Amino acid sequence: YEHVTVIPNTVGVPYKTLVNRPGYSPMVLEMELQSVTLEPTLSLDYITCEYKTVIPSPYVKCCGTAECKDKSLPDYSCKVFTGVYPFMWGGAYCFCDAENTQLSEAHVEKSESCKTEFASAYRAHTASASAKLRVLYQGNNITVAAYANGDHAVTVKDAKFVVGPMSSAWTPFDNKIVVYKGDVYNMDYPPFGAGRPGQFGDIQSRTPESKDVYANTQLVLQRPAAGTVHVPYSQAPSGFKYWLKERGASLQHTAPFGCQIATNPVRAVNCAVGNIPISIDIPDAAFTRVVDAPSVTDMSCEVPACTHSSDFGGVAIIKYTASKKGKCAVHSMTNAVTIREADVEVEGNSQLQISFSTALASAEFRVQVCSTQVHCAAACHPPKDHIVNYPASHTTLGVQDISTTAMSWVQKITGGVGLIVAVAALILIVVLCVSFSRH
Amino acid sequence: TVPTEGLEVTWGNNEPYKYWPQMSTNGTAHGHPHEIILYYYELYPTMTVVIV
Numbered sequence: 001y002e003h004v005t006v007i008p009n010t011v012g013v014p015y016k017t018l019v020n021r022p023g024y025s026p027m028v029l030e031m032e033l034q035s036v037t038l039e040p041t042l043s044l045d046y047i048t049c050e051y052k053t054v055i056p057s058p059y060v061k062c063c064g065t066a067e068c069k070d071k072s073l074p075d076y077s078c079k080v081f082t083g084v085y086p087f088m089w090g091g092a093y094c095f096c097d098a099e100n101t102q103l104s105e106a107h108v109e110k111s112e113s114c115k116t117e118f119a120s121a122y123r124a125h126t127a128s129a130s131a132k133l134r135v136l137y138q139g140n141n142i143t144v145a146a147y148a149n150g151d152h153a154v155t156v157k158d159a160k161f162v163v164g165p166m167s168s169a170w171t172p173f174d175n176k177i178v179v180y181k182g183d184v185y186n187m188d189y190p191p192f193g194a195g196r197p198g199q200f201g202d203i204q205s206r207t208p209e210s211k212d213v214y215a216n217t218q219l220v221l222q223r224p225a226a227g228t229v230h231v232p233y234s235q236a237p238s239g240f241k242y243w244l245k246e247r248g249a250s251l252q253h254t255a256p257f258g259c260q261i262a263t264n265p266v267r268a269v270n271c272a273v274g275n276i277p278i279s280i281d282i283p284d285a286a287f288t289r290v291v292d293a294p295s296v297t298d299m300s301c302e303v304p305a306c307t308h309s310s311d312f313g314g315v316a317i318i319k320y321t322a323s324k325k326g327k328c329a330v331h332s333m334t335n336a337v338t339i340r341e342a343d344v345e346v347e348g349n350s351q352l353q354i355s356f357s358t359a360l361a362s363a364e365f366r367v368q369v370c371s372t373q374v375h376c377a378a379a380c381h382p383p384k385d386h387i388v389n390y391p392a393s394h395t396t397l398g399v400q401d402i403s404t405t406a407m408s409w410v411q412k413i414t415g416g417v418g419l420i421v422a423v424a425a426l427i428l429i430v431v432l433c434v435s436f437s438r439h
Numbered sequence: 440t441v442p443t444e445g446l447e448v449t450w451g452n453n454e455p456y457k458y459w460p461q462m463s464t465n466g467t468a469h470g471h472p473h474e475i476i477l478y479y480y481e482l483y484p485t486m487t488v489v490i491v
């Protein structure tokens with residue numbers, strides 16, 4: 001037989017899925033996923049890196065006036081200055097004074113650091129879904145890695161699991177992601193070829209090997225003075241070397257629902273959102289008929305200790321009478337409580353304990369054990385400590401949870417005065433039966 | 440403060456800490472005085488006094 005179920009999307013929390021089948025011994029499984037990985041698409045928009053302003057040695061034309069040559073350089077910036085007067089070892093480099101001119105030119109390139117250190121503005125859209133899970137399967141700890149599409153299923157030990165497709169269409173990203181070497185940022189980058197001055201992406205490249213470079217930096221030359229033989233320029237402010245200080249916070253420390261961010265390739269880890277449908281196909285070679293199954297009867301259930309916490313909340317003890325020695329399973333028949341131990345050994349006329357947890361104080365429930373229904377009831381107590389560092393999702397119960405005899409209390413409250421207003425209607429209509437004949 | 444959802448706190452370079460609230464401690468009883476109501480201030484408060 002096969003079975004389709006839904007587990008809540010969370011890590012470190014097992015789930016007891018029943019398999020009941022007509023005329024056969026039932027079989028329970030437990031789901032416990034270790035990593036569900038959301039892996040977004042990859043489409044590179046543009047790399048970016050730290051630039052490099054290169055000027056050569058400046059030209060000097062004394063007893064003459066030099067002039068530029070127009071050239072398609074990355075931020076070509078040239079200027080000829082007059083009235084200048086250089087100084088060196090032997091005073092002035094030239095002879096006359098008022099005619100000494102200086103040609104100057106500046107351009108920009110990438111750096112040597114862009115080979116191995118860079119950020120990248122990046123285009124990423126709706127993800128896949130990978131997952132890794134563990135099941136205990138007749139005492140068999142079984143790992144599984146599978147994608148949550150619907151046809152990357154898995155056959156292990158005559159077991160067909162398929163996971164997905166994910167009901168939760170939510171993602172921890174946007175359409176625009178910048179990434180640098182250990183983190184991502186849900187950021188809004190400027191497009192290609194329109195980089196702002198003083199911003200990462202002032203210089204832009206399509207690949208790490210693109211010689212065609214876009215630049216927007218305004219290396220604006222200034223006037224050199226007497227003796228100051230050099231090239232004065234307006235400094236281009238970087239993008240990186242203050243953008244490293246204006247990071248804000250990475251998506252590692254502001255993701256919703258505790259989504260971790262890995263790298264190479266970048267992926268979301270343990271995004272606990274919503275729920276996953278899981279289908280199991282296991283054929284009939286693995287089952288057993290009930291004639292070979294040790295069936296039990298005459299159960300008496302009592303709960304001598306229950307504490308409604310997120311931990312192993314309580315231990316109940318139930319007395320059984322087994323037909324013969326063997327193994328069989330237990331499971332709740334209500335989604336409020338949950339039961340830790342899947343199957344259990346039975347031998348004869350004895351009793352067994354079972355650990356369970358819940359949220360509702362008046363624990364009124366039923367346990368299915370070994371193709372037999374048993375009824376139980378108790379009243380629990382609140383735990384005596386406030387915080388903890390592990391949850392267990394039995395507690396996720398609504399507003400139709402079960403209160404105590406407070407139910408009988410509020411049943412006593414709704415007494416009602418409908419009876420007195422009914423006798424009011426009857427006394428007014430016995431006034432009106434003076435003549436209320438044919439209305 | 441901790442929400443009913445849960446907290447997570449990172450301190451320095453070290454490993455993160457996770458936190459969750461229990462059904463906290465106390466407050467009245469299943470008592471002979473009626474008084475389950477302060478168990479309410481235990482059990483998910485600040486709503487549901489709209490219900491009373």
Ligand SMILES: *[C@@H]1O[C@H](CO)[C@@H](O)[C@H](O)[C@H]1NC(C)=O
Nearest residue numbers: 114115116117118181208264
């Ligand atoms: C060093 O940088 C190169 C450049 O892309 C990268 O491929 C490589 O993985 C990096 N190695 C380490 C150890 O960071």
Ligand SMILES: *[C@@H]1O[C@H](CO)[C@@H](O)[C@H](O)[C@H]1NC(C)=O
Nearest residue numbers: 134135136138139140141142
């Ligand atoms: C299966 O693995 C879990 C966690 O690794 C462990 O707690 C449990 O005892 C194991 N059970 C068996 C039967 O190996």
